[PDB]
RNA sequence: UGGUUUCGCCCGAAGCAUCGGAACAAUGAUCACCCAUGACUUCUGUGUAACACUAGUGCCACAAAGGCUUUUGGUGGUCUUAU
């Protein structure tokens, strides 16, 4: 149905992906939520980031968070100075958050990598912490 | 005896801005960059829909991206002197 592109509201997405079920379902919920979120990533606000963070912790995987990472890329969030200064925050499991932070530095680095006078060293440190260095 | 007042020189606290001037600091200007973007395309790549067919794909269509008319606010330093 979602591939037929039917509306999945924000709270709808939270309640939907809120699925503790049989095995091998966390990554399925992850790809579903990444399909639904690649539009806006549960970020129609900036305090919707708490909802999205419970969503990331429910995806409970570095690989799931990386699916959401490429989804954020396919989302192409806004670009303001302070926007990226506050949107370069990353700290998670070091198995595909590696790919996530590296791909974020890559998308921003195709032109003018993050160099907010702190955010560059911050991206380096968070990358090494997520195993992206 | 000290005083007063006056003049001449010697020193020159704060200060007057002039200049002196060169050399920092801030805009103008140079070429490229914190970096998307206005452009859209060749595929290239990439997450997705629609639809017959092989066990999944020409189109769908943002975007991760190179490279484009460029501009652009400012970035970063860049200029030379203009102030």
Distance in angstroms (rounded) separating the CA atoms of residues A71 and A79 = 16
Residues 18-57 of A with CB under 7 A from strand B: 31, 34-35, 38
* Rounded distance in angstroms from the CA atom of residue A84 to the C1' atom of nucleotide B17: 49
Distance in angstroms (rounded) separating the CA atoms of residues A133 and A125 = 8
Report whether A132 contacts A101 (CB < 8 A): yes
Residue whose tokens read 């926007």: A83
How many degrees, rounded to 5, is the angle at CA A46 between CA A40 and CA A50?
90
* Rounded distance in angstroms from the CA atom of residue A91 to the C1' atom of nucleotide B76: 30
Q: Which two tokens stand for residue A47?
A: 């305090």
What resolution in angstrom units was achieved for this structure? Answer: 3.9
Nucleotides of B under 7 A from a protein CB: 33-37, 46-50, 62-66, 73, 76
Burial (0-12, 13-18, 19+ Cβ within 10 Å), A98: buried
Going by C-beta distance under 8 Å and a sequence separation of 6 or more, which residues neighbour residue A39?
A75
Distance in angstroms (rounded) separating the CA atoms of residues A91 and A9 = 27
Helix axes A26-37, A62-75, angle to 10 degrees: 10
């Amino acid at each position: 149905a979602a591939a037929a592109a039917a509306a999945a509201a924000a709270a709808a997405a939270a309640a939907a992906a809120a699925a503790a079920a049989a095995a091998a379902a966390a990554a399925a919920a992850a790809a579903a939520a990444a399909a639904a979120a690649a539009a806006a990533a549960a970020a129609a606000a900036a305090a919707a980031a708490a909802a999205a963070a419970a969503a990331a912790a429910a995806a409970a995987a570095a690989a799931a968070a990386a699916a959401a990472a490429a989804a954020a890329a396919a989302a192409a969030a806004a670009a303001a100075a302070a926007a990226a200064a506050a949107a370069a925050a990353a700290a998670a499991a070091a198995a595909a958050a590696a790919a996530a932070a590296a791909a974020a530095a890559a998308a921003a680095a195709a032109a003018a990598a993050a160099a907010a006078a702190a955010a560059a060293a911050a991206a380096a440190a968070a990358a090494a912490a997520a195993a992206a260095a």
